[PDB]
Amino acid sequence: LLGRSGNDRLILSKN
Numbered sequence: 694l695l696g697r698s699g700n701d702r703l704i705l706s707k708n
Contacts, residue, residue, distance in 0.1 A: 699706025 694701045694703035694705045696705035701707050
């Protein structure tokens, strides 16, 4: 999460 990439907790890749 916290961004637009890959797939994290919500929105974000990971790094």
